[PDB]
Structure 1
Amino acid sequence: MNDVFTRAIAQADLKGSFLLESDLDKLASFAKEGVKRLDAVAALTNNAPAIISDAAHKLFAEQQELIQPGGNAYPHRRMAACLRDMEIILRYVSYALLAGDASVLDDRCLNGLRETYNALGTPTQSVARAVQLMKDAAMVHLKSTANVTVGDCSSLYSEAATYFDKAAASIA
């Protein structure tokens, strides 16, 4: 269960050395910028209903098979499973955003999710499309500058994009 500082510490310990000057420099830079990361995390947190609802709407509009009877999100319990899975993926994406590390996502939430979906007959491709629609809605919600000080967040935007892309690629 790792964040960026803990990965840095792990590397410094495998080498057996103290942390190097450049490492402390980049960690201090990350910590100073971290206030903006916290706002990105709060934007994901407070709006996740909206991201999930929009992603589900676009997903089932594109693939109306998953709502057909015999489709894999057909009954109310499977629709609930779909929404809950999307919400958990988004939760662990925001966890990775806070920690600035993909360890929590990859270990806790995606170590064996592909094999689970294959075992249950779930189309992993629709799962990946749900994740990508989630990332699009999350980008739109991160772009929002309401009640916050304007600034440049391209670092956080790229990290969120690569988090969602890692999620999609690990699923499928």
Structure 2
Amino acid sequence: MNDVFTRAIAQADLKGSFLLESDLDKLASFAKEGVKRLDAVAALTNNAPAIISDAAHKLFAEQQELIQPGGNAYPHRRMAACLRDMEIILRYVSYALLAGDASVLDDRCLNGLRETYNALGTPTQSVARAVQLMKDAAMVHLKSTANVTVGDCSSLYSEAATYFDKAAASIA
């Protein structure tokens, strides 16, 4: 895939000259907040089932037409596919968070997920709402300062919300 370091290297190679001091300084800062990034990724990972369950409960309370017979998530298999899709989207979002690049999420999944959901008959605004609820559930765990030293991670919250809303808008 592509990383922020990889992205900078690609841009430098396109113009074919060495990475500038400003680029090196930005990448050094990135490596300096890498520890905070690891904590954010661990927060997303360690509560992923809780995030999925909260998002699913809130979504299905919001939209009962999916539960009821004839809905897009009515039988057990369609429910399980729903949960698996939420889980895989969360996993890709955490991948993007760790790398700092949205390529790992944009490359394999979001390009064909549009055609897949259109073909299967899923309501796309429903899936976008599911991803937004996942973001809302995940922010609480990202904020949780228990068991981690108190610090500021506004950049991490902004970037994670960026990845979440980007995936939701892509599927939308």
TM-score range, shorter chain: over 0.9
Partner of 1:65, secondary structure, is coil
- Give the RMSD, CA atoms, in angstroms: 0.5
CA distance, structure 2, for counterparts of residue 114 and residue 73 of structure 1: 18
Aligned residues: 172
| 1:10-60 alpha-carbon deviations (Å, 9 max, x no partner) | 000000001011000000000011100000000000100100000000000
Shift of 1:96: 0.1
Partner of 1:52, secondary structure, is helix
CA distance, structure 2, for counterparts of residue 119 and residue 37 of structure 1: 37
Question: Among the aligned pairs, what percent are the same residue?
Answer: 100
| 1:96-131 alpha-carbon deviations (Å, 9 max, x no partner) | 000000000001221110111001110011100000
CA distance, structure 2, for counterparts of residue 109 and residue 51 of structure 1: 20
CA distance, structure 2, for counterparts of residue 139 and residue 123 of structure 1: 25
Q: Deviation above 6 Å: which 4+ runs of structure 1?
A: none
Partner of 1:110, secondary structure, is helix
CA distance, structure 2, for counterparts of residue 95 and residue 49 of structure 1: 16
| 1:70-109 alpha-carbon deviations (Å, 9 max, x no partner) | 1000000000000000000000000000000000000122
Q: What 5-or-longer segments of structure 2 have no aligned partner?
A: none
Shift of 1:164: 0.6
Q: What 5-or-longer segments of structure 1 have no aligned partner?
A: none
Shift of 1:166: 0.5
| 1:77 is the counterpart of 2:77 | yes
| 1:27 is the counterpart of 2:27 | yes
Q: TM-score, normalised by structure 1?
A: 0.99
CA distance, structure 1, for counterparts of residue 94 and residue 108 of structure 2: 13
CA distance, structure 2, for counterparts of residue 69 and residue 92 of structure 1: 31
Shift of 1:146: 1.2
Partner of 1:9, secondary structure, is helix
